[PDB]
């Protein structure tokens, strides 16, 4: 040390002989295949050695050597940014791209691998790889539905192109993949479906026109159907994508609802997996922040008893989302609709939230209780009686205590709200 890579490896790598070049390359490749810690730093630190591999990519008469070399560079291009920058600076990218078109399958595959690593390193590496025109010849690769490892690599690499919100890729540079992507949803392989959902979630993760674009490739129905997939690998990203699409306006969200998503979301509300329940709650909250009919479609899917049961039984991350789901409904609902929520028993679970640390949740819960008190006030005048039906009910859930306790809470808006509510609705 140094010399934990052969003196002879340098000698062979740099020789005239193709056999020795390959032999050394193989040693490199196996050492970089090492699970615990591969010698990335040592390799990068012998100064013409990367460049040599990059030149070996150019050897169109040699399948093996091209392949092993792409493998070596694939691994250096794994893990960190500083080791990846060396591969970029030796100009490996245009070469790998040109290698997307090689007559060799193995080379084609490994090259898409390495490019996936490089694009997945950072934002500027991502755009740098788009700028070198990876898309056309990458997309071209799906046109042979025969080979699986290649298709996995490609969607995988592709989701790296779409990934990253800071800044997002230039949409126009990335939105050409929507076709391939929509129809890869009908394929059978778990990994392929998973990455195509990742990719579709990254692309739906933005403003309404980007969502529109995802909607127009018609993936919604597949995406909603994949919520029922047996493998979590597929369900999470699909859940994200559907989750992202429903951040749009009411029309865009309607498209998801027209695919009968709610019935699947309800199912997901019982997932063993907490992140799934959490994500399904959040998706629901964005549906119950829509118009009266959407709220009502959530009522009729029987979603609300599961949300309430979630508020009572689940992790605080999860319950936050259920809580938003319920208060949004009280905010956009008809009187009959809020009566339904009260009759279900949403009052106590809101009142229990009032004493948690997260101030927003407290606000959320107060917002919903306000909304309910407001409808009840509106009722005391339609009917004869001048008593608010929800006053006694909020008191009975120890909600009244919590709200007074909240007058001495440190937060300004909290104490104020609690004060105005006591004054407006309690005696």
């Amino acid at each position: 040390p140094g010399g934990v890579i052969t003196s002879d490896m340098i000698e062979m790598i740099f020789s005239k002989s193709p056999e020795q070049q390959l032999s050394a390359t193989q040693k490199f490749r196996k050492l970089l295949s090492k699970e615990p810690n591969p010698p990335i730093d040592e390799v990068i630190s012998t100064p013409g050695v990367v460049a040599r591999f990059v030149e070996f990519l150019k050897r169109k008469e040699n399948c093996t050597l091209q392949f092993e070399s792409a493998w070596v560079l694939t691994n250096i291009a794994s893990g960190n940014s500083l080791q990846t920058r060396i591969v970029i600076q030796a100009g490996a990218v245009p070469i790998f791209i040109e290698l997307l078109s090689s007559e060799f399958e193995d080379v084609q595959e490994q090259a898409v691998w390495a490019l996936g690593n490089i694009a997945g390193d950072s934002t500027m590496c991502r755009d740098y790889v788009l700028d070198c025109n990876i898309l056309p010849p990458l997309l071209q690769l799906f046109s042979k539905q025969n080979r699986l490892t290649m298709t996995r690599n490609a969607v995988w690499a592709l989701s790296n192109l779409c990934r990253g919100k800071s800044p997002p890729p230039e949409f126009a540079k990335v939105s050409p993949c929507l076709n391939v992507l929509s129809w890869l949803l009908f394929v059978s392989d778990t990994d392929v479906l998973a990455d195509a959902c990742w990719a579709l979630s990254y692309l739906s993760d933005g403003p309404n026109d980007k969502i529109q674009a995802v909607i127009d490739a018609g993936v919604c129905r597949r995406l909603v159907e994949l919520l029922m997939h047996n493998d979590y690998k597929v369900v999470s990203p699909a859940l994200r994508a559907v989750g992202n699409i429903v951040t749009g306006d009411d029309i865009q969200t309607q498209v998801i609802l027209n695919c009968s998503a709610l019935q699947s979301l309800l199912h997901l509300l019982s997932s063993p997996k907490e992140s799934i329940k959490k994500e399904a709650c959040w998706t629901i909250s964005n549906i119950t922040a829509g118009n009266r009919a959407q709220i009502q479609t959530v009522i009729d899917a029987n979603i609300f008893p599961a949300l309430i049961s979630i508020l009572q039984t689940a992790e605080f991350r999860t319950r936050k989302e259920a809580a938003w789901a319920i208060t949004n409904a009280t905010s956009g609902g008809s009187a009959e609709q809020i009566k339904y929520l009260v009759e279900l028993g949403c009052i106590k679970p809101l009142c229990d939230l009032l004493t948690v640390m997260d101030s927003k949740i407290v606000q959320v819960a107060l917002n919903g209780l306000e909304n309910i008190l407001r409808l009840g006030e509106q009722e005391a005048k339609r009917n004869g009686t001048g008593i608010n039906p929800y006053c006694a009910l909020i008191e009975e859930a120890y909600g009244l205590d919590k709200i007074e306790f909240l007058q001495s809470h440190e937060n300004q808006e909290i104490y104020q709200k609690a004060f105005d509510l006591i004054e407006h609705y309690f005696g």
Binding site: L32, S33, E35, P38, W71, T74, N75, A77, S78, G79, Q110, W113, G116, N117, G120, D121, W156, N160, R163, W198, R240, T247, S275, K278, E279, W282, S285, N286, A289, R317, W324, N328
Partner: peptide
Amino acid sequence: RRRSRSLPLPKRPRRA
């Protein structure tokens, strides 16, 4: 409204 929410590790080494 919009938003845990984390992702797969972006890089993958070829092993074995």
